[PDB]
Enzyme design. Structure first.
Site, PDB file in Angstrom:
ATOM      1  N   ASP A 155      14.968  -2.853  12.151  1.00 52.33           N
ATOM      2  CA  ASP A 155      15.624  -1.731  11.502  1.00 52.33           C
ATOM      3  C   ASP A 155      14.717  -0.526  11.471  1.00 52.33           C
ATOM      4  OD1 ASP A 155      17.629  -0.227  10.361  1.00 52.33           O
ATOM      5  OD2 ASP A 155      17.290  -1.035   8.329  1.00 52.33           O
TER       6      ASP A 155
ATOM      7  N   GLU B 196       0.834  -1.209   0.000  1.00 47.75           N
ATOM      8  CA  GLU B 196       0.000   0.000   0.000  1.00 47.75           C
ATOM      9  C   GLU B 196       0.870   1.262   0.000  1.00 47.75           C
ATOM     10  OE1 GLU B 196      -2.077   1.636   3.676  1.00 47.75           O
ATOM     11  OE2 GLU B 196      -1.088  -0.060   4.539  1.00 47.75           O
TER      12      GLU B 196
HETATM   13  O1  LZ5 Z   1       7.826   4.782   0.308  1.00 44.94           O
HETATM   14  C1  LZ5 Z   1       6.630   4.825   0.292  1.00 44.94           C
HETATM   15  N1  LZ5 Z   1       5.944   5.967   0.100  1.00 44.94           N
HETATM   16  C2  LZ5 Z   1       6.472   7.263   0.079  1.00 44.94           C
HETATM   17  C3  LZ5 Z   1       7.499   7.624   0.952  1.00 44.94           C
HETATM   18  C4  LZ5 Z   1       8.019   8.903   0.924  1.00 44.94           C
HETATM   19  C5  LZ5 Z   1       7.516   9.833   0.035  1.00 44.94           C
HETATM   20  C6  LZ5 Z   1       6.499   9.485  -0.832  1.00 44.94           C
HETATM   21  C7  LZ5 Z   1       5.972   8.212  -0.808  1.00 44.94           C
HETATM   22  C8  LZ5 Z   1       5.830   3.619   0.535  1.00 44.94           C
HETATM   23  C9  LZ5 Z   1       6.298   2.350   0.851  1.00 44.94           C
HETATM   24  C10 LZ5 Z   1       5.191   1.593   0.998  1.00 44.94           C
HETATM   25  N2  LZ5 Z   1       4.135   2.399   0.788  1.00 44.94           N
HETATM   26  N3  LZ5 Z   1       4.524   3.667   0.510  1.00 44.94           N
END
Ligand code: LZ5
Length: 290
Positions: free
Chosen positions: A119, A73
């Site tokens: 982590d 998600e």
């Molecule tokens: O990394 C994810 N989303 C995100 C993080 C920072 C900036 C913008 C989007 C992520 C991993 C799992 N779901 N969303």
């Protein structure tokens, strides 16, 4: 992966690139992580059923072509960016409390199922517009290890590592997550990383400088740990009133329990949820700039 359209690279995880992607048929926007051991695949597959409102949902595990893709998600920001953004004025306390409270609920659920994260760090705590916060990459460290460096060579942060890991304990517990979240809690309050070590010895000596060099009194068995040295310097413990001003006595009380040296004395996620710091817990909506 033919069923996905990569929208943008959002980041670079410990294991590989993270893409924002759309499912070419369901229309779903997801996070796609590109990462084969028989063991790893069984481990990840159990993660598919470890579902909680505060754990980023693993939608799908795709093993193709000796390639491994995890479909999660999508959440629109992480806590590290939000903290950077909230630098000048700080994340308000009621919102810090709601986040910690939600994170603890996350940990209590996983931990009751014997899954450690291992982590935890602000880059893998994700936030939405509704006031929620959720733990990403839960259980992946057991499946895949934790590298000194990522696939891009970026150094894995030591800042949130429990001391029993730094001292070479092979068989650490759920308490290592409590320790990390404690470090993250301190950071939200003060707007500065609690222990920002740049090697394992710097990491440990930073812990020691604030918490006191650990001994057999506070931590039975410590002097028998693999990387313990009788030659460590002996630093005195500082007061928390100096470490996390202007955090209140309940906050400081809880923080100290989350940072007990002995992992057996370290407060559990479940007990933490009962602590009086959360008596007045609410759920504020942050202002996000999507
Ligand atoms: O990394 C994810 N989303 C995100 C993080 C920072 C900036 C913008 C989007 C992520 C991993 C799992 N779901 N969303």
């Amino acid at each position: 992966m033919e069923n996905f359209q990569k929208v943008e690279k959002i980041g670079e995880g410990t294991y590989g690139v993270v893409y924002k992607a759309r499912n070419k048929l369901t229309g779903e926007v997801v996070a796609l992580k590109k990462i084969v051991p028989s063991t790893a695949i069984r481990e990840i597959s159990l993660l598919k059923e470890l579902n909680h409102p505060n754990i980023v949902k693993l939608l799908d595990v795709i093993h193709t072509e000796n390639k491994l893709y995890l479909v999660f998600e999508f959440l629109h920001q992480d806590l590290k960016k939000f903290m950077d953004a909230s630098a000048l004025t700080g994340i308000p306390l009621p919102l810090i409390k709601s986040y910690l409270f939600q994170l603890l609920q996350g940990l209590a659920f996983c931990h009751s199922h014997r899954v450690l994260h291992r982590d935890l760090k602000p880059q893998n705590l994700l936030i939405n517009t509704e006031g929620a916060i959720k733990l990403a990459d839960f259980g992946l460290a057991r499946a895949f290890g934790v590298p000194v460096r990522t696939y891009t060579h970026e150094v894995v942060t030591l800042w949130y590592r429990a001391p029993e890991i730094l001292l070479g304990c092979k068989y650490y517990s759920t308490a290592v997550d409590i320790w990390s979240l404690g470090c993250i809690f301190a950071e939200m309050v003060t707007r500065r990383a609690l222990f920002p070590g740049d090697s394992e010895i710097d990491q440990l000596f930073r812990i020691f400088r604030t918490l006191g060099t650990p001994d057999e009194v506070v931590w039975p068995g410590v002097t028998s740990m693999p990387d313990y040295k009788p030659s460590f310097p002996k630093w005195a413990r500082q007061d928390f009133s100096k470490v996390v001003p202007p955090l209140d006595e309940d906050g400081r009380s809880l923080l100290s329990q989350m940072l007990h040296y002995d992992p057996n004395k370290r407060i559990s996620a479940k007990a933490a949820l009962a602590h009086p710091f959360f008596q007045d817990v609410t759920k504020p909506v942050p202002h996000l700039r999507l």
